[PDB]
Amino acid sequence: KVKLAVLSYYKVDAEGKVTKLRRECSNPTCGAGVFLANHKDRLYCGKCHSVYKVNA
Amino acid sequence: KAEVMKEVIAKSKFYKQERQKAQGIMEDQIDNLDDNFEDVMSELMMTQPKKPKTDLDKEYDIKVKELQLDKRAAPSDRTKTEEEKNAEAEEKKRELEQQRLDRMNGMIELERGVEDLDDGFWENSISCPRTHDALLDQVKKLDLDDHPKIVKNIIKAYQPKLAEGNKEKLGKFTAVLLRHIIFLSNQNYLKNVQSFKRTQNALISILKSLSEKYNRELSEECRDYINEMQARYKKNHFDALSNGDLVFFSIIGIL
């Protein structure tokens, strides 16, 4: 089990600016807010199960 | 007859091979489609379409939350008739009576017999107290007549359902309670015999309820008290023997 996994996906700057550290799944079923899992060779979606290249 | 059996065996085999051939064809098709997934998915992805609840559906969501707010009822079972309860109670008396009779005859439950045992013998908030002192730790400041109240509260505070492991805590408490009952008898009580009688029988009643569910834990403690008192008899003889030892042999017969 991973605790506060959501916290890791995005970051704060001292000015309150929020930045996303993970790419979001392009699938409109996923819509916005579905973050791809970052593997060594591929980006994986937990909802659509689609596979994207890391540097695509 | 034999030729019919061979045809049946041959037909079954001929049917089995067809199924295996069909299974292989199905697996081959699956492999080809999986290889073509990416081409199919991409074209499907490009042609994807662009982005009021039923009145019945609206009511259900309203109901669900309203039912969440409301209180819930406790379920009860059908009441058995007095004859059925008596018939059941009369039955349960029968097997227990029969079970006791067989054991007087030598039936041993592990259903072995006494003769089997005689082979080789001759040739060769509220705190649960895990220890007898710990039970007193909660009960120094309480009066003699208050012992049943605290003891009962300990069982209530650590019932099996409340948390995991409460079975073990109560089982150890069963052994702890037994030593307390013995411990009180050894203590002088001529001053307050009536108060002692109000505690001494009450604790035994609690122990009986505990023994019904913790006979295993009680029996282990009972053996340990049995084993200990020879050792005191092994050095002190009667000076080891006290009122509580007389009390102990009484309680064993009860439980």
């Binding site: - | 699956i30 489609l33 998915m41 499907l44 042609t47 259900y60 379920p75």
Partner: protein, 259 residues
Amino acid sequence: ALPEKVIKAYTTVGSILKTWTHGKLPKLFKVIPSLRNWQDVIYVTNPEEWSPHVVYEATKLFVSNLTAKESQKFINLILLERFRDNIETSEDHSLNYHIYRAVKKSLYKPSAFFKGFLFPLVETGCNVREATIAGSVLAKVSVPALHSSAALSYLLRLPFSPPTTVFIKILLDKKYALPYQTVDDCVYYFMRFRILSNGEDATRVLPVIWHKAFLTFAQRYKNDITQDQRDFLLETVRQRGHKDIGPEIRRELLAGASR
């Protein structure tokens, strides 16, 4: 229309689903829930011609992935129809095991199941055999008390039909902790068959299933109704009590304490 290449690919997927019995599904079939137009993609796979094994795995695949609103369409349009089609066309009017397991899988999502399978069925000419088969699934699978209480309340508001009375009996047989709002509605249901001005339910003949359901309620929630509700239900028996069940129901009502 879908891309012609896609149509050919999913057409071959469907042909596999016709005879599929075991193993891994075609990977194309696996990702259908993740598509917006899964309905269109599902149509080209011929849901009516899916083997019972495919229906079981398809229910697993779609109930988990699709949203609650979308799973209701899948249960309503495919699983409900297949459940009806198999019962109607089977020689013994029995349900296939795989479809019987699929309906359990769809029950993993109570809201979609209730709005997609049960409520459409009872409101669309459900028959006794359908209710018995569906009721058995509801009997064995664990269902939430909250979701069931809402479902039982609605069935207690529908017009009387023996197929609906079975599901009312099943839900009562579950021995749930119904909220008193549901209990009052349950009292109202049986209060609507007494002779008073009243509707045809007062003079309507009552099968044994109605009496068994009323005995089922009496044996359990006798401790969760008011004294006035007890009197209303007690005199309902006096007017509509059964020969043999009725006297037993009287005993259970009188043995209960008012809340």
